[PDB]
Amino acid sequence: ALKTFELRKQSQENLAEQLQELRQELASLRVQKIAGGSGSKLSKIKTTRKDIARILTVINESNRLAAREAYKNKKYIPLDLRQKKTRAIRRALTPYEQSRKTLKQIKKERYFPLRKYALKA
Amino acid sequence: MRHNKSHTICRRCGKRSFHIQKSTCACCGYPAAKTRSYNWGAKAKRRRTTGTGRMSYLKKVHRSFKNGFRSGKPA
Amino acid sequence: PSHKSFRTKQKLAKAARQNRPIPQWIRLRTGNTVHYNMKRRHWRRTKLN
Amino acid sequence: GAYKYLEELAKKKQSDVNLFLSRVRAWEYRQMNVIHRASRPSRPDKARRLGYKAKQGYVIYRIRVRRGRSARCTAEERVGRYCSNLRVLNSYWVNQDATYKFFEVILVDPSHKAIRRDPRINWIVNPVHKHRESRGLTSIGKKSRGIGKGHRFWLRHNTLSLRRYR
Amino acid sequence: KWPEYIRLQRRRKILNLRLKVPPAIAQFQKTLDKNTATQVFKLLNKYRPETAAEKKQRLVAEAEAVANGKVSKKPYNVKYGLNHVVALIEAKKAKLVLIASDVDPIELVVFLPALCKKMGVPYAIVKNKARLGTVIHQKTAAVLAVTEVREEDKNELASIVSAVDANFSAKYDESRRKWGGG
Amino acid sequence: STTFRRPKTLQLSRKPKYARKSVAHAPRLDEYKIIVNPINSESAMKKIEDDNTLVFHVHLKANKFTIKEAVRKLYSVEPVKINTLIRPNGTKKAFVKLSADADALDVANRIGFL
Amino acid sequence: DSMYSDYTKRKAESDVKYRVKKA
RNA sequence: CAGAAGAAUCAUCGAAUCUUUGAACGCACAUUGCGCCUUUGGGACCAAAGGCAUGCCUGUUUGAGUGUCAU
RNA sequence: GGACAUGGGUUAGUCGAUCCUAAGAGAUAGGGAAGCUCCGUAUGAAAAUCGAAAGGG
RNA sequence: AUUGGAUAUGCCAUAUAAAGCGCUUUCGAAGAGUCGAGUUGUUUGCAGCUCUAAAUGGGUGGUCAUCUAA
RNA sequence: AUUUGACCUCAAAUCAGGUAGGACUACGCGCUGAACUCAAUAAGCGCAGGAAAAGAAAAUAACCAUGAUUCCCUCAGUAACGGUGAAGCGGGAAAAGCUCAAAUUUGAAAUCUGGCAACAUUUCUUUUGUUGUCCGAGUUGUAAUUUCAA
């Protein structure tokens, strides 16, 4: 099968053409199965299916990194590019606004913080 | 003389419990937004509760949680 | 009848595939208790409902 | 500060001025909807001492409920259900008539950044405060369920604790 | 049939002019006369507070002056804000008081005419909160107070105070104890 | 003097700050998925050399325009009629009657299922 | 005044339906 | 069993895909029913991609008001 | 054998559904209810839909 | 590969400020259809309704003691 | 005449950005609630979390006084009510305190969301911010100081 890394160092159109010829080959392999083929062809059906899956994977990755580059350093980005941990974590308070304190509390923690002490036994 | 139907296949829950005239499923309560459930039917709850299906997303979340919900690509 | 809907036909289609005999090679596998079919239905017998 | 004068005037509800204003206002809210937005509170002194600030994020809704359970608690529950993206901060009586009691409910938008960045109201954004009006955690809710401090205000009896060694 | 919002808009007006109004509210719809109001706003136009841009220009100017080589004059402006005005009345620092005639919650201004009379402060009720808003560069100003001016403006400030006395205190002076409306 | 209907306010179109989906989705009904397999049963084989027709097992979402476009883009053969049915097992079978210019035998030979 | 008088006139027949008790 | 031969029905798993539905969201659904908007492609028509639920909040735009006013 | 096993078999612009509506059901604007929700659907709004494989086509 | 907190070390900050403590020659703002009372209902507590407060006042316990609600 | 600009109210948008629903329910908080004290139980309805609730006295006491809440032993099957059935004190587990409204910064709205442009930072090209500029919110009160222990 095609190696994923050398699939990555190619351009969009070549992967598109490789995708197209793979589909021709898969269609040819399946009609051999219907009309009667050898075990090599029946086993080749699976490996060519996986190789199209590899090409779809690398194409989608290249598109998504391209989109992330386009939306890099922006306030709003597509919901697919946004993180998805849980709905609760997304709705929760961020650490910055959990650490926000009034100036009254800032003065209190400036002047009377939790001191470092000890007792002699 | 028994050649009519009272219930049909439900869209939401896939059982032949969706009444035709009333147009409400006796099993899941569709088209009500809330799924029909009753605490006296403990066995009825456990036949349709979570875990009787694929739980495809919940298994995804659990494996994600076990690692602190990290994202990106390793070295 | 001869006026069934698509959903009825599709449900019939898989119900016809479910009651088929089991391939022998899956029986011949090791650690495979499957040696017969316990979901074999017949049209004259129990209805699909 | 004028809020002292506003508060002292609100004490005397049988005054001629208060009676005229209440009747005119209650009439106005009648052909208004049952629940309607109020861009500015009708009792700014009451709203401020109940926790309302004139900043983006605080919402005032006016609700009328018929008389004849606690009307203030019912008003909070209905407004909370009607605005599902808002946390019910508090509520206060504004007006009444022969059959309709009028309340104004203060709500806070937890999704707004002016609320999420304010340390003095940030507590309401936490998920433990979803639908306080329904769980009975508001001022009128606490008073209705009898939560208080003193001899005046079940599971410890219906159980028979069996220790290891006995 | 007209929408319900405009129906209620007209119906509130008719009832406010129809019902028996207690004197504490009846004193409001009697306001200052035209020409006195224009002279009021002509005087206040001189003493409107500095805008945000003017404030920023002053702040950066004094900041760079202090930074490079180095305190300003006494500000003269009209005093706004309900609490700040009420404080000035309490301290008797205010010389003239202007109250908008159409405050939405009327209790916010109902106590003022009694309070200025108790402190002997010249007060007048002027038309529309919007005009006061433009004076102080705001959308809404419920009350304005003039407490200090320049020396050359003291003469006509005394004159307009006498004029508003004549047209608001010498005239009327009975609506505060007359059952208005009806 | 009657029917106080709403005034006409302009209808601003959508001006999003970001697309709701990061990348567009490739066409999900392409000719390769449309034409799944050909039937070579004897009844279909009879139709092959008695009606200039090919019997294809097509995707269950395909409509007559789509198989027409699919076979044209996959075989460059010009059909004249298409008839679709759904088999009792839940699979769509399409009879594509070609034009008299093309030969069903030659197409079957080049596909490789005769 | 005319609008309210018309309102009462229509309510006399169309919007009668007052009978406020439904068990 | 056959089969070719970084393999494997391996483990881990942070990158993706995820069809029709379902709170289910263009309108409906005992119907592979009926639509509309934008763009593209094909040799009017078809196809493809992206969209169109409800209530509420903040802001934007346009308004409506013989509501209050200033010229 | 209608049972079992292996296969094959239902081709529509013109036949039906799909379209329309009847009895009827019911969204919406509003009004109630502690509430899941009931009345309301031409109704005092800044404007439907479903329902017939024996009806109409 | 992450981090959580400290130690050593470097760089920015801007204090013309802010805060704690002892005195007053001073004033000390404090939550209303809420408390409370009558009546009906639920297991003092709560709710419906008539009525409706005060500012060394109000609540609680037997003039005193203790708290400072809405 | 009437044209121009404000403020107020109310609309409309497939406007920009967000949010609510549904599911689980052992534990948690409410509403409601029978029958054979049963039982503030079962059922029904609403709503959360990793705990929930309660919580820094409008509290106990009558003492040489105790001092937020929660849980455990004890008080005690006592007081009380007509079978129901506490609490104070005492011993432990754990401990942590606080925040607003009510007073003028009046020599200066010192406050804040959003748009735009950079700078950054990340469990992360997925996160969270900083500065500058514009508009808006806001004097019908956003900031700083004050919460009775003062």
Ligand SMILES: [Zn+2]
């Ligand atoms: Zn169902």
